[PDB]
Design an enzyme around this catalytic site. Structure first.
Site, PDB file in Angstrom:
ATOM      1  N   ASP A 385      59.487  64.145 -20.580  1.00  0.00           N
ATOM      2  CA  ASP A 385      59.728  62.937 -19.791  1.00  0.00           C
ATOM      3  C   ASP A 385      60.714  61.867 -20.434  1.00  0.00           C
ATOM      4  O   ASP A 385      61.659  61.458 -19.770  1.00  0.00           O
ATOM      5  CB  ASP A 385      58.587  62.228 -19.536  1.00  0.00           C
ATOM      6  CG  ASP A 385      57.567  62.940 -18.620  1.00  0.00           C
ATOM      7  OD1 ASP A 385      57.990  63.830 -17.536  1.00  0.00           O
ATOM      8  OD2 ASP A 385      56.281  62.899 -18.680  1.00  0.00           O
ATOM      9  N   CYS A 419      69.953  67.803 -11.399  1.00  0.00           N
ATOM     10  CA  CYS A 419      68.978  67.072 -11.937  1.00  0.00           C
ATOM     11  C   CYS A 419      68.707  65.825 -11.087  1.00  0.00           C
ATOM     12  O   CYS A 419      68.618  65.868  -9.848  1.00  0.00           O
ATOM     13  CB  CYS A 419      69.354  66.625 -13.444  1.00  0.00           C
ATOM     14  SG  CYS A 419      70.582  65.752 -13.737  1.00  0.00           S
ATOM     15  N   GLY A 422      72.837  64.424 -11.476  1.00  0.00           N
ATOM     16  CA  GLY A 422      73.771  65.301 -11.742  1.00  0.00           C
ATOM     17  C   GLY A 422      74.600  65.290 -12.968  1.00  0.00           C
ATOM     18  O   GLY A 422      75.691  66.076 -12.917  1.00  0.00           O
ATOM     19  N   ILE A 423      74.311  64.553 -13.805  1.00  0.00           N
ATOM     20  CA  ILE A 423      75.151  64.272 -14.933  1.00  0.00           C
ATOM     21  C   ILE A 423      74.596  64.480 -16.463  1.00  0.00           C
ATOM     22  O   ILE A 423      75.308  65.079 -17.264  1.00  0.00           O
ATOM     23  CB  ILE A 423      76.023  63.032 -14.986  1.00  0.00           C
ATOM     24  CG1 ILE A 423      74.938  61.635 -14.593  1.00  0.00           C
ATOM     25  CG2 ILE A 423      76.784  62.709 -13.689  1.00  0.00           C
ATOM     26  CD1 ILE A 423      75.633  60.167 -14.457  1.00  0.00           C
ATOM     27  N   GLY A 424      73.343  63.839 -16.698  1.00  0.00           N
ATOM     28  CA  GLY A 424      72.625  64.116 -18.026  1.00  0.00           C
ATOM     29  C   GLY A 424      72.282  65.524 -18.191  1.00  0.00           C
ATOM     30  O   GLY A 424      72.886  66.115 -19.018  1.00  0.00           O
ATOM     31  N   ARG A 425      71.105  65.749 -17.761  1.00  0.00           N
ATOM     32  CA  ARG A 425      70.651  67.327 -18.036  1.00  0.00           C
ATOM     33  C   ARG A 425      71.458  68.402 -17.305  1.00  0.00           C
ATOM     34  O   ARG A 425      71.844  69.336 -18.147  1.00  0.00           O
ATOM     35  CB  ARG A 425      69.061  67.386 -17.335  1.00  0.00           C
ATOM     36  CG  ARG A 425      68.244  66.400 -17.763  1.00  0.00           C
ATOM     37  CD  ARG A 425      66.728  66.933 -17.444  1.00  0.00           C
ATOM     38  NE  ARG A 425      65.910  65.685 -17.273  1.00  0.00           N
ATOM     39  CZ  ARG A 425      64.722  65.532 -16.822  1.00  0.00           C
ATOM     40  NH1 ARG A 425      63.972  66.670 -16.441  1.00  0.00           N
ATOM     41  NH2 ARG A 425      64.203  64.526 -17.117  1.00  0.00           N
ATOM     42  N   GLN A 466      74.902  62.449 -21.132  1.00  0.00           N
ATOM     43  CA  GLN A 466      74.546  61.171 -21.173  1.00  0.00           C
ATOM     44  C   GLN A 466      74.306  60.437 -22.400  1.00  0.00           C
ATOM     45  O   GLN A 466      74.556  59.272 -22.734  1.00  0.00           O
ATOM     46  CB  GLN A 466      73.481  60.912 -20.115  1.00  0.00           C
ATOM     47  CG  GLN A 466      74.221  60.823 -18.566  1.00  0.00           C
ATOM     48  CD  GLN A 466      74.722  59.577 -18.459  1.00  0.00           C
ATOM     49  OE1 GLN A 466      74.229  58.723 -18.347  1.00  0.00           O
ATOM     50  NE2 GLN A 466      76.094  60.042 -17.924  1.00  0.00           N
TER      51      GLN A 466
END
Ligand SMILES: Cc1csc([C@@]2(CN)[C@@H]3CCN(c4cnc5c(-c6cccc(Cl)c6Cl)[nH]nc5n4)C[C@@H]32)n1
Length: 485
Positions: A385, A419, A422-425, A466
């Site tokens: 988390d 995710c 749509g950018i970090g994970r 990110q």
């Protein structure tokens, strides 16, 4: 530019700098020295400084009492161009930073002998660096390679950069308030020597590209922190990637975005074939397998997501999120059939591994039986988390399986990856997958460049990767893969 970002200031220094060297409407951004991961937007108004917190837990930059963004540059761009949105606080005059730390060409305390090795070995014509002067503390040295391409014809040239009363020069002419202003001037206006050699500053010297064999040594070097230096230098280059996202801003497409201001670039976006062609999605081609980085579905875009999958001939979906609704359930229950507009999806079977659930899905277009194909949905479930996985074995095993699936299917389309935003994970997975596929095909004897690979991906969708923790995790994942080989 991104010179409004000051990486080494405290909050007291931020205030005093805005109150002395700024005016009303002046602003700067800075990392949260107390809580690393967070940032602060310090703005001046009515002869006083107001500090606005910005958190990034890994998905997006969340401005407190504001909107969510893919990069800080895209954040600053939005509020400079949309008056009265920040509450009322105007961003007028970016207070520029003098500190060379986050520039590609700045190498810090690097000796003269070791600068010359690197330019001889790794450098070519116009390759340069700036370093702290061994002799004169306060001064700097600009080391440039010139000539052709042992050989004879090329050469290194050093140029002493004197610091006199807080300004910088090359022993004559204009005196600059920062090394950046100095370097950018002599990029534009190259120094010429007495015998006609033009000291061109074509590109900074690459020291991030490693041979994959020496990953363990480089991670050891970056741990003693050097990870921050490499990451914040990469973050400084996001100002190059403010390409247009006009189609996501159209009224017709406003409610088709999960996050209003996290938009797909026009030049890479997936175009679906009143304004029915839009989806918050981008083709990611490396520079051979490709990807589609997209958001988690909204209720109103599930039909569009399935049209995208069908159109693009995508056979593999990587979903990377398991106390908030990051994604709407866009697939039928086990054994059930559903129609999502013109598209039809059966869930043939679900299979539980430890880290993930696999769903075998049969996608077809309604009215056409011949259009059927199997889409394999890999739902990764063990991502924590807060933060990143402490061990990368799960992600690597997952991606290995995902890869072997894609490779088993002849003429399969891009791997869909999503995710929340749509950018970090999504970006962390895709980049790990790019770097591992290099090592898999060409073996341990091949060059890889982590921040270069990220920048290449960041130019195709905004803010791919990110946080520093995800940056660190990509390294740790690539290391673990080479060790287990
Ligand atoms: C204070 C101090 C001491 S050592 C040091 C620095 C940062 N200035 C010295 C200089 C070398 N460097 C670098 C070099 N290329 C970097 C890329 C990068 C690499 C390739 C392509 C692109 Cl498009 C980018 Cl953006 N991201 N990040 C990078 N970092 C790391 C280290 N700073």
């Amino acid at each position: 530019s991104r010179r409004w970002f000051h990486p080494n200031i405290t909050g007291v220094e931020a205030e005093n700098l805005l109150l002395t060297r700024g005016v009303d409407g002046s602003f700067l951004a800075r990392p949260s020295k107390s809580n690393p991961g967070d940032f602060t937007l310090s703005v001046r108004r009515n002869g006083a400084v107001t500090h606005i917190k910005i958190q990034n837990t890994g998905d997006y930059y969340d401005l407190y009492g504001g909107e969510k963004f893919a990069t800080l540059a895209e954040l600053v761009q939005y509020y400079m161009e949309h008056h009265g949105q920040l509450k009322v606080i105007e961003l007028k005059y970016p207070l520029n930073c003098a500190d060379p730390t986050s520039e590609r060409w700045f190498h810090g305390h690097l000796s003269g002998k070791e600068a010359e090795k690197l330019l001889t070995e790794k450098g070519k014509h116009g390759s340069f660096l700036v370093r702290e002067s061994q002799s004169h503390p306060g001064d700097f040295v600009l080391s440039v390679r010139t000539g052709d391409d042992n050989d004879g014809k090329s050469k290194v040239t050093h140029v002493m950069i004197r610091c006199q009363e807080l300004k910088y020069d090359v022993g004559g002419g204009e005196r600059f308030d920062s090394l950046t202003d100095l370097v950018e001037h002599y990029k534009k206006n190259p120094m010429v020597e007495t015998l006609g050699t033009v000291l061109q500053l074509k590109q900074p010297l690459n020291t991030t590209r490693i041979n994959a064999a020496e990953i363990e040594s480089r991670v050891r070097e970056l741990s003693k922190q050097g990870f921050w230096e490499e990451f914040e230098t990469l973050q400084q280059q996001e100002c190059k990637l403010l390409y247009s996202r006009k189609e996501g801003q159209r009224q017709e497409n406003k409610n088709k975005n999960r996050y209003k201001n996290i938009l797909p670039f026009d030049h890479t976006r997936v175009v679906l074939h009143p304004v029915s062609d839009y989806i918050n999605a981008n083709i990611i081609m490396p520079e051979k397998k490709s990807y589609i980085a997209t958001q988690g579905c909204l209720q109103n875009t599930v039909n569009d997501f399935w049209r995208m999958v069908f159109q693009e001939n995508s056979r593999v979906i990587v979903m990377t999120t398991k106390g908030k609704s990051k994604c709407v359930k866009y697939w039928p229950d086990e054994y059930a059939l559903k129609e999502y507009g013109v598209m039809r999806v059966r869930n043939v079977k679900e299979s539980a591994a430890h880290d993930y659930t696999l769903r075998e899905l049969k996608l077809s277009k309604v009215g056409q039986g011949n259009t059927e194909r199997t889409v394999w949905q890999y739902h990764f479930r063990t991502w924590p988390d807060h933060g990143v996985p402490s061990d990368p074995g799960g992600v690597l095993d997952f991606l290995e399986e995902v890869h072997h699936k894609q490779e088993s299917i002849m003429d399969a389309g891009p791997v869909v990856v999503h995710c929340s935003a749509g950018i970090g994970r999504t970006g962390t997975f895709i980049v790990i997958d790019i770097l591992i596929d290099i090592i898999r095909e060409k073996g341990v004897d091949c060059d890889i460049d982590v921040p270069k690979t990220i920048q290449m991906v960041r130019s195709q969708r905004s803010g791919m990767v990110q946080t520093e923790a995800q940056y660190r995790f990509i390294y740790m994942a690539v290391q673990h893969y080479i060790e287990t080989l």
